[PDB]
Amino acid sequence: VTPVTWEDVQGARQNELVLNYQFRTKLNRVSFIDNYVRSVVDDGTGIVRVGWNREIRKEKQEVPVFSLFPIQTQEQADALQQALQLRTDNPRGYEENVDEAIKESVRFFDETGQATYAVQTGTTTTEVEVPLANHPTVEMLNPENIIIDPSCQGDINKAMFAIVSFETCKADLLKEKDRYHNLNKIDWQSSAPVNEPDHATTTPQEFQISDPMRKRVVAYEYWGFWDIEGNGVLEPIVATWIGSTLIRLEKNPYPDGKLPFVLIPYMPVKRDMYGEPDAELLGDNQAVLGAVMRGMIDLLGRSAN
């Protein structure tokens, strides 16, 4: 990441480390690259799906509360600025070793600037939500499982809708506690990959899981722009339905405001989306070469020796 103007240097450094960290740990960099090139080369074009993952969980903890008292003497008053100096010079070091009471003291200093002592006197059982699995995700979609608007005039940006079919489980849907509605109305026997020939997958047709929570089902997502209001302006929305039952309908949550799919052609076609792979030009050459090789073997093989 490189800054555009002189005041953007700090932003470039911060984002570059975060972006590299996510691909280094949250994703298999080598496997993703191998699938990235091979998908483009073999199929003639590559389609990449971008989506965020979030699995925050509810948790109950016994939070302490500290009583606040003013500065009784300057002897302990220096500890307030010592934490501030440590926090500015080394935020990680400040978190690990500085006492929670001192953390509360500097916390009140940030709010009001008043130097106050902190004394632990009581505690209570609060309700918090510990973050978990808050990282982006990237996937390569099979071209048969995704449909793009033909009237896009060879540009993904001008496409008005896109439908992608993917597999999921009930536990996977339960990761979001409010994103989906009417989940209980659907049945887990129908809409299975066995009963959805339109969706291509590597899962065996005979494979199934007895646990309803881990049941495999096929889901459809609708990404595009719709005139959600009678005024006459299109808005980006996302819709999801399983088994002819609508379960999700909301606007686009991403700040980008457009489709999260990226198209990469191998050999671009004039005013078209899908490119041409190398197999298009070598159709006749391979067949002719195969005929010659078989003829040579037949001459030697059938001959007496």
Partner: protein, 100 residues
């Protein structure tokens, strides 16, 4: 294109090398600022154009003291000159008691 962009930087370096750096700080800074932009260093380029010399207060006092130092030396000679003819004139006065 990278070919012309790289060659342009060499010309700026050639101009900087050819022109004596002592003719003007502003001219030197502007040339360096353009080179930084060609090297895609916006932060460095901004500093060069906005760079200012650091004022040294004690240096000015020493610089000013040297100016008045020479003034006193000139007055020292004039004071000594007024002493030279004073000795000569007094010597002339003492002659009269001898050649009376």
């Amino acid at each position: 294109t990278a070919e012309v962009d790289n060659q342009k930087s060499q010309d700026l370096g050639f101009m900087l090398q050819t022109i004596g750096p002592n003719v003007d700080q502003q001219i030197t800074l502007n040339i360096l600022a353009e080179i930084a932009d060609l090297k895609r260093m916006p932060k460095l380029a901004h500093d060069l154009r906005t760079w200012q010399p650091q004022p040294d207060p004690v240096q000015e006092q020493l610089k000013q003291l040297a100016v008045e130092k020479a003034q006193l030396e000139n007055e020292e000679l004039r004071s000594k000159i007024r002493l030279n003819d004073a000795q000569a004139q007094k010597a002339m006065a003492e002659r009269d008691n001898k050649n009376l």
